[PDB]
Amino acid sequence: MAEIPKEMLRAQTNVILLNVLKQGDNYVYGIIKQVKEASNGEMELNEATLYTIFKRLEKDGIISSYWGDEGGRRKYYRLTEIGHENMRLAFESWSRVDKIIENLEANKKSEAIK
Amino acid sequence: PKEMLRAQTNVILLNVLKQGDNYVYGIIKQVKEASNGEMELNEATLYTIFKRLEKDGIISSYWGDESQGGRRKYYRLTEIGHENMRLAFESWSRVDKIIENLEANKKSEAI
Ligand SMILES: COc1cccc2c1C(=O)c1c(O)c3c(c(O)c1C2=O)C[C@@](O)(C(C)=O)C[C@@H]3O[C@H]1C[C@H](N)[C@H](O)[C@H](C)O1
DSSP: OOSOOHHHHHHHHHHHHHHHHHHOOEEHHHHHHHHHHHTTTSOOOOHHHHHHHHHHHHHTTSEEEEEOOOOOOOEEEEEOHHHHHHHHHHHHHHHHHHHHHHHHHHHHHHHHHO | OHHHHHHHHHHHHHHHHHHOOBOHHHHHHHHHHTTTTOOOOOHHHHHHHHHHHHHHTSEEEEEEOTTTTOOEEEEEEOHHHHHHHHHHHHHHHHHHHHHHHHHHHHHHTTO
């Protein structure tokens, strides 16, 4: 079928959460709240989905966590320096993909004239 | 990175087939040519992706060149494949807006 597959869906959630963190260190609750506001109430993530994703991100060295303060202590997550680098390299990589796509279209268009 | 290179090869391949039916060697050549020799797609990875896109009905395939004594597999982008590309663009656009909204709402809370 044509539906967005679970690998692309996971890639999409990833990008959103990594962009939340890129704006500022945040705790799970705050993160979910921010995404809900930014999706106009339509994307309200399950905290378990964040924990699943953060597990792997933390394991990969892309985010880390630390405790806030108190009435009660919060766990903050943060984009690491390698996280930030990764995001830049991914922007650049995919920007090159887009140029290759651009060129495939241009060559098709130009070879049709000729 | 593993999964993102595969995702990239996926997108590129879909785009070559959108440009017209093609076979595995031609796709790899065409992509290398569109990248000035810099992108060389892994044959192995093409086959793994093709196997999956065929199962999803996103691409189909047929034999060509039997009149020349050959037997070469060509791939084509199906209507399901066109839609998949539409939805990918639409869902990633949706992602972009949300991220744009995150930046603006952040900016609302600075001023
Ligand atoms: C159909 O395209 C895709 C299909 C499957 C997976 C993917 C994509 C895809 O397009 C894609 C991206 O475009 C980008 C990323 C990505 O993972 C994917 C896919 O996984 C990574 C990214 O979040 C970072 C860190 O820069 C942004 C980047 O988009 C770039 C270019 C866009 N035009 C936009 O400006 C965005 C903000 O940055």
